[model samples]
Target: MIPSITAYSKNGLKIEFTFERSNTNPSVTVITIQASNSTELDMTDFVFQAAVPKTFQLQLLSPSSSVVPAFNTGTITQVIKVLNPQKQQLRMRIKLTYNHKGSAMQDLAEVNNFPPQSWQ
Candidate 1:
């Protein structure tokens, strides 16, 4: 089975990431981020980072350097600039390479659910 962790932003946005571990190596891991926000929150304004093994190298794949779209109904004022309006969700994928110097771990205790203070 794959290990997974769920986190929440200060603005009621929930983000969950599932890990894929190779049979030969437990240190290397693949992480994915699936996020959803029901409140009037913009995900782009918030920060999303992961904590992994001390010796592991982290790379963001889907966002290509954490470049998330300025979702509408959350932050962006211009409708044309908004990426997704109806779903109010975002997704990210990351790849981690373990250097075999440390154990695998995750730091996701800071995430939680709270209504957003503003849409802009």
Candidate 2:
């Protein structure tokens, strides 16, 4: 099975962490990243290809090298959110915040970039 992680900040930046595409099929499951026994640990540059609504959290390895619930910090924290994981692949993404004060409903830096580019 293939595993991946994607994350975003309030600044509208996204990152993706992928190990390898499953050699069996495209369908995969999204699971909490465990740091105790897992191998991959790099999530600094993880990106999210989907839309993130408010503050999102899940189990995984953060910059501190410890597994914890991470958040997203996107510009449109009040208007965007990642609903759920579809049958595309298995990965994780994060949102720092869901609300910004006096912030207009504007698209993130590259919100127009349909089919967002990946970050390897």
Candidate 3:
């Protein structure tokens, strides 16, 4: 199962977040964050984070020490900071985002496709 969200700022910058559940382990899930910059301007001091539910385990595979558990607030905030602008392609992979609340991850139709929400 998978789910995703994509957003574009008025300035024409594009960002995407995609989630995929593990087939072998129902509790485990993966999330991929990607950003595209076509303009000549370089993105500086970029930081990315997610408001993850407390029920899952958050791990950042692409970046170091990406594993963290939910805090007392029943939620965890994971962060990734990119010091380099890298105006080409910025991509990140979160290997795990467990679903402890529900018995199984939901297979939503929204996860299976990729299109700008503003499109027809």
Candidate 4:
């Protein structure tokens, strides 16, 4: 089992990625992102993206909606498919850009806190 990998942005956006299946393994790791806003501003046209992993291929699906409600009003989710066909450990990264209060903002973060066991 893989634990949830959580990330935070400067604008009060909290994002967490977790394996959708009970057993995340050497095959396609079906991952999902749970996003929420802690600030008073909404993230309209939210784009959730994760960079390619060196040990595997990636297929990141679209999100539930473009607007992520502000002030913890709602939840936003997206799915990403990762296939470790070659059977190497995984590498991960995340990026998000959105319009908050009519201004453009972006969040780029590294996801390295997951245990090595999760690489399986």
Candidate 5:
């Protein structure tokens, strides 16, 4: 089983990472992976994989050392066949590692017919 990772800053920047197995089988397949919208830029192009010991990584084909920005909203997910030849299960233990800074509360607005509220 993969653990759940949730991160939120005081500035309305909230994000979470969760892994799940929908069905049991000789081999495992990735169902879904989601990322939050705390980030300013669209990170929908990121790549992620669960290989062993539940370790996960974001693969962005970019030259910049600062690949992923501090605040962004996006997620990546992958499905792979079980490696039986190497005695590895289709399920790979994955770990979530993230580095975040600052917050983003002032960036959100009222939702659908909802008016903004002010505190006195």
Candidate 6:
């Protein structure tokens, strides 16, 4: 079993990544990314990418949409499938790109706080 939720927020946007054991493969972790906006502006051209260490394999899938609905009215969903055969401590670096109210923006975030249960 993995974490039910972990979250971060920036520039009026919030992201939560929930981890779960893969039903088909115990060595795999399924991450569901939940994206929501708190501001009045809708998010456009939304994209997310993540990188992990060499021992792990990561699969990033397309999001529910390129546009994130405004004011927490809706959520954008994305999935990341990871395999940690080596069971190393999980570390993730994320890059986010999006446009809000005619302004283009980017952000970088690092996550190393995942619980040990994530690997085992």
C-alpha root-mean-square deviation, each candidate: 16.7, 12.5, 17.1, 2.3, 14.4, 1.2
Instruction: Show model 1 residue runs off by greater than 4 Å.
Output: 23-26, 45-47, 51-53, 64-120
* Candidate 2, poorest ten consecutive residues by summed lDDT: 73-82
Residue-level lDDT of model 5, residues 10-41, one tens digit each, is 33333343444326542332233343445554
Question: What TM value does model 4 have?
Answer: 0.84
Estimated TM-score for each candidate: 0.41, 0.21, 0.41, 0.84, 0.28, 0.93
Question: Which digits, one per residue and each the tens of the lDDT, describe model 2 over residues 41-74?
Answer: 2223222223322432223322333221234321
**Who wins the TM-score comparison?**
6
TM-score, model 2 to reference: 0.21
Clashing pairs in 4: none
Q: Rate the local accuracy (lDDT) of all candidates.
A: 0.35, 0.27, 0.35, 0.77, 0.32, 0.87
lDDT of candidate 3 over 96-115, digit per residue (tens): 32222332221111222333
lDDT (Cα, tens digit) per residue for candidate 4, span 1-120: 677777554668888777744265547778788899888888888998887567678888878999889878888989888777776766677888999988998878887675455556
CA shift of 89, model 6, Å: 1.0
lDDT of 6 at 28: 91
Error of 1 at 66 (Å): 8.0
What C-alpha lDDT, on a 0 to 100 scale, does residue 63 get in candidate 2? 38
Q: How many clashes show up in model 2?
A: 27
Off by over 4 Å in 3: 1-4, 7-10, 63-120
Question: Which is the better candidate, 2 or 5, if ranked by lDDT?
Answer: 5
> Worst ten-residue run, lDDT, model 6?
1-10
lDDT of 6 by residue, 1-120 (tens): 566555568788899888888989889988899999999989999998999999999999889998888879988999999999988898899898999989888999997777777777
Give lDDT: candidate 2, residue 67.
21
